[PDB]
Amino acid sequence: EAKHQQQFFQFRLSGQTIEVTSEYLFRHSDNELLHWMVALDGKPLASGEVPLDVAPQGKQLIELPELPQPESAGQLWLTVRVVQPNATAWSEAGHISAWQQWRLAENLSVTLPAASHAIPHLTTSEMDFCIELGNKRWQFNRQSGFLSQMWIGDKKQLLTPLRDQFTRAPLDNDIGVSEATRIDPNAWVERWKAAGHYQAEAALLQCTADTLADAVLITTAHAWQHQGKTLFISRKTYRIDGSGQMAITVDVEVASDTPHPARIGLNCQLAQVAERVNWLGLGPQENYPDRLTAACFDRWDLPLSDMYTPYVFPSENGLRCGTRELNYGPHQWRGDFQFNISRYSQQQLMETSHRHLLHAEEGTWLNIDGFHMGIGGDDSWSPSVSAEFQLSAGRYHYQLVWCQK
Amino acid sequence: CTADTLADAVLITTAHAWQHQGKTLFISRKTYRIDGSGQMAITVDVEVASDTPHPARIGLNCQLAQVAERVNWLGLGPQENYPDRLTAACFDRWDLPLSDMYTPYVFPSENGLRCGTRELNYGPHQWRGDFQFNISRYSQQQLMETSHRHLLHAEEGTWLNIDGFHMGIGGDDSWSPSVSAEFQLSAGRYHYQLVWCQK
């Protein structure tokens, strides 16, 4: 982020041309070339290299060629980079000094899914709701109202039920100068624990199931309470399609008087560990709602070890925003969400105070959040998060599609 | 366009798409739920293309067949307020005549919008949820076509426009786009829920 925000080259896309403005004051652009690439949902279509000849604090105009626009559904992204060909005394050959990305024309998906010939079968137990579709199987716990288990063949895929998560591991900016012996009432973590965010117990309100013509609909509605005061109300709709897709639509209502939650989304612990994570979204670095300018939208395939940022003081880390697709092992999640996946739970990151004392848990912890709250950074003793990055709307909605690839 | 009965409700799933010259601009997916108590639950999800210009409105539109003399809404009022001009309005219960719902601008344009509305009672109809509503005797197409307020004529029934999201009005100048980026409909995906019942 520091590298992207301190670039000596500013880019402005107008129509099809690109205005490049140098911020150098004394040197001429003699060791830089511009490399542009157009990608449809992570799949490249066209590319080219244009040398840069920019005067100090000057202007240059680059006229792009005919950009291919296919009729396939997706979003076209244009990414430009500045590459230094020769080796400077402080940089190697091929060093990138600046980059920028823009959203080109979008082709919305208007096609219809094929008719599901096979229909899901629903068994209504006294304490469970079990949906079977060939190899696929799901089991909802009627006592808790959450997705208790998923089955492919005879292998369990969930160690813990897929629940909601309105809390995160407190960051260094959230704690502030608050200790055990000194309590700062303005610190975000103290307001969260004072309102019972970390101690809220989910109470089941509604849990119904009914079969449709070609699908099975599960309607769940919970409420989080603390000392008789309701903080959050979550209403979820689960749809099992005959093609195998799980459509989860979640609506969250947050009280106005309670402190703004740091996270609105889901949480689970998968029973299978994988060595690769392939996500289409903003990356490949750790990015947040107030720190996503450096990240670029593309398809990134990275090992699970790089999903966890090795902060010595444990906190929330590894979040990737603007994620359009996420492939992990046999699981695929689609929609617009912010995901973080690691081997350590959020409660372990909260309890532990050193990274060397952290231990990898069974399975893999995954946190998919429809909405995430900022990190701040103006100072480490006062709330530094701007009002535009705080979860203060009151009503939130997000849709997830869970399938097996 | 599908319909199916539930254990205690009837679900209607509709999904449309707006196109122009072979290019899709907006995609609307609606879910209608008829409950046994009489409530209509309409959940609408709208997808807007990024390259197209930002729409000025995302919501519903209808023309009721009954005219009423009072409008009773719980929300921000009692004046005409907009997403960038709602600081003066206060949240309360306002009961006002239908004649005051239309601001008599001599040059016809969009008017009468009330933001932050939590409930809206008009005749036998009651709408609940979070929405921005404007109700008048003149359609939006008539306001577009007509250039004077004295040439406007009241149509049959009453035109109602309930919008989940509304875009700003500007006002810095009358010759350049004055609407700030925070008041523009540029998120891409929008969702709103309405409850229509008879009181």
Side-chain angles (χ1 to χ4, degrees):
Chain A
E1 181 76 23
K3 195 195 177 179
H4 173 71
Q5 284 308 314
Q6 298 173 315
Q7 294 166 183
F8 295 92
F9 290 112
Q10 294 306 288
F11 306 95
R12 186 177 91 141
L13 177 66
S14 63
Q16 209 186 57
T17 194
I18 295 175
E19 181 203 324
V20 187
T21 303
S22 177
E23 287 183 350
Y24 287 118
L25 301 155
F26 318 99
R27 70 176 299 272
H28 194 94
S29 187
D30 52 354
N31 200 35
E32 285 101 5
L33 59 93
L34 197 139
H35 172 91
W36 61 272
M37 169 180 315
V38 172
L40 179 59
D41 271 12
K43 181 204 134 77
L45 300 174
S47 86
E49 291 93 56
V50 182
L52 290 175
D53 190 5
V54 197
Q57 34 199 6
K59 209 152 309 299
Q60 202 203 350
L61 264 302
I62 318 277
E63 270 273 347
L64 264 42
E66 199 32 47
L67 295 195
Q69 186 182 357
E71 76 283 331
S72 179
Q75 179 69 83
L76 273 186
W77 291 84
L78 167 66
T79 315
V80 294
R81 296 193 258 100
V82 167
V83 190
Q84 301 181 5
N86 309 132
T88 322
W90 52 269
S91 67
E92 80 270 20
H95 178 68
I96 302 142
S97 43
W99 62 93
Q100 196 72 230
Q101 210 179 28
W102 301 283
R103 227 174 298 131
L104 294 179
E106 186 180 3
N107 284 335
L108 282 182
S109 163
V110 291
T111 206
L112 299 177
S116 54
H117 309 279
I119 67 144
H121 181 250
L122 170 68
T123 48
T124 155
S125 301
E126 191 128 6
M127 78 311 316
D128 276 320
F129 280 145
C130 192
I131 319 176
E132 304 92 5
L133 187 65
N135 196 357
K136 294 335 186 47
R137 192 176 295 105
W138 305 269
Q139 187 195 34
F140 292 85
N141 199 264
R142 282 170 72 163
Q143 295 300 110
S144 82
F146 297 117
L147 174 62
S148 97
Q149 198 54 255
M150 308 201 18
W151 273 287
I152 43 163
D154 51 352
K155 315 296 263 284
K156 302 197 295 289
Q157 307 284 260
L158 297 185
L159 294 171
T160 71
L162 173 66
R163 318 170 85 258
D164 307 69
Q165 207 196 348
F166 306 110
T167 83
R168 77 186 178 193
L171 306 173
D172 272 348
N173 296 346
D174 301 345
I175 301 166
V177 286
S178 66
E179 299 180 3
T181 201
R182 284 169 326 171
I183 293 101
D184 177 39
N186 261 79
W188 270 108
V189 60
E190 306 271 36
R191 304 221 297 279
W192 288 329
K193 312 167 67 44
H197 281 201
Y198 293 96
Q199 272 133 40
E201 328 86 346
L204 171 74
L205 265 64
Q206 185 183 3
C207 189
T208 60
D210 42 352
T211 170
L212 318 173
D214 70 313
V216 170
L217 204 61
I218 323 288
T219 326
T220 87
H222 294 93
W224 275 253
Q225 293 163 326
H226 184 255
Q227 287 190 12
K229 176 131 199 301
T230 311
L231 313 166
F232 320 105
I233 289 171
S234 197
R235 295 207 181 82
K236 296 197 214 58
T237 312
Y238 298 88
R239 187 166 57 84
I240 287 312
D241 215 27
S243 176
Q245 283 89 21
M246 172 78 114
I248 314 172
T249 73
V250 184
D251 299 328
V252 176
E253 315 178 25
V254 179
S256 60
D257 53 344
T258 197
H260 305 137
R263 168 176 288 176
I264 292 185
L266 294 173
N267 181 283
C268 78
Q269 197 193 6
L270 309 158
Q272 154 170 0
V273 66
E275 76 296 325
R276 313 289 325 161
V277 179
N278 187 43
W279 90 94
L280 174 66
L282 296 171
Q285 297 287 331
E286 164 175 276
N287 54 307
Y288 278 91
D290 51 351
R291 202 185 58 181
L292 41 77
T293 53
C296 288
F297 192 94
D298 211 56
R299 171 80 65 173
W300 310 104
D301 170 301
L302 279 188
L304 189 57
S305 73
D306 281 313
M307 276 323 124
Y308 156 72
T309 303
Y311 288 128
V312 182
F313 187 81
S315 73
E316 150 70 27
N317 65 91
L319 192 77
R320 261 80 179 181
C321 306
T323 303
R324 271 330 198 96
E325 200 201 14
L326 168 63
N327 313 346
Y328 179 83
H331 301 290
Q332 177 183 108
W333 295 276
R334 283 191 254 104
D336 214 273
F337 52 90
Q338 292 82 239
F339 83 101
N340 83 72
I341 177 161
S342 66
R343 293 301 299 279
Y344 321 105
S345 177
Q346 295 273 324
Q347 64 163 42
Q348 187 185 174
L349 294 174
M350 218 189 150
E351 286 148 344
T352 321
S353 52
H354 289 90
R355 69 171 187 185
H356 81 282
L357 301 167
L358 286 170
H359 71 95
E361 294 169 35
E362 329 156 330
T364 314
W365 279 99
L366 166 83
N367 311 313
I368 292 176
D369 324 309
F371 296 88
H372 211 278
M373 197 233 87
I375 71 187
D378 298 284
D379 51 27
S380 303
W381 38 94
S382 294
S384 298
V385 191
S386 323
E388 63 212 64
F389 299 117
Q390 292 179 29
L391 298 192
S392 65
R395 305 158 280 98
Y396 295 81
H397 166 62
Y398 57 87
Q399 295 178 356
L400 260 280
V401 183
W402 195 350
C403 56
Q404 273 56 276
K405 65 168 199 58
Chain B
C1 189
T2 60
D4 42 352
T5 170
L6 318 173
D8 70 313
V10 170
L11 204 61
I12 323 288
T13 326
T14 87
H16 294 93
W18 275 253
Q19 293 163 326
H20 184 255
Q21 287 190 12
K23 176 131 199 301
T24 311
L25 313 166
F26 320 105
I27 289 171
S28 197
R29 295 207 181 82
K30 296 197 214 58
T31 312
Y32 298 88
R33 187 166 57 84
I34 287 312
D35 215 27
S37 176
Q39 283 89 21
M40 172 78 114
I42 314 172
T43 73
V44 184
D45 299 328
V46 176
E47 315 178 25
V48 179
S50 60
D51 53 344
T52 197
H54 305 137
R57 168 176 288 176
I58 292 185
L60 294 173
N61 181 283
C62 78
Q63 197 193 6
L64 309 158
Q66 154 170 0
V67 66
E69 76 296 325
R70 313 289 325 161
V71 179
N72 187 43
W73 90 94
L74 174 66
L76 296 171
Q79 297 287 331
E80 164 175 276
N81 54 307
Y82 278 91
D84 51 351
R85 202 185 58 181
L86 41 77
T87 53
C90 288
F91 192 94
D92 211 56
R93 171 80 65 173
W94 310 104
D95 170 301
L96 279 188
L98 189 57
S99 73
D100 281 313
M101 276 323 124
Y102 156 72
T103 303
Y105 288 128
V106 182
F107 187 81
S109 73
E110 150 70 27
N111 65 91
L113 192 77
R114 261 80 179 181
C115 306
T117 303
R118 271 330 198 96
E119 200 201 14
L120 168 63
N121 313 346
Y122 179 83
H125 301 290
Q126 177 183 108
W127 295 276
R128 283 191 254 104
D130 214 273
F131 52 90
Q132 292 82 239
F133 83 101
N134 83 72
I135 177 161
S136 66
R137 293 301 299 279
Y138 321 105
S139 177
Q140 295 273 324
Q141 64 163 42
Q142 187 185 174
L143 294 174
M144 218 189 150
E145 286 148 344
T146 321
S147 52
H148 289 90
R149 69 171 187 185
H150 81 282
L151 301 167
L152 286 170
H153 71 95
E155 294 169 35
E156 329 156 330
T158 314
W159 279 99
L160 166 83
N161 311 313
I162 292 176
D163 324 309
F165 296 88
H166 211 278
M167 197 233 87
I169 71 187
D172 298 284
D173 51 27
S174 303
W175 38 94
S176 294
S178 298
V179 191
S180 323
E182 63 212 64
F183 299 117
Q184 292 179 29
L185 298 192
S186 65
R189 305 158 280 98
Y190 295 81
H191 166 62
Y192 57 87
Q193 295 178 356
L194 260 280
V195 183
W196 195 350
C197 56
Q198 273 56 276
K199 65 168 199 58

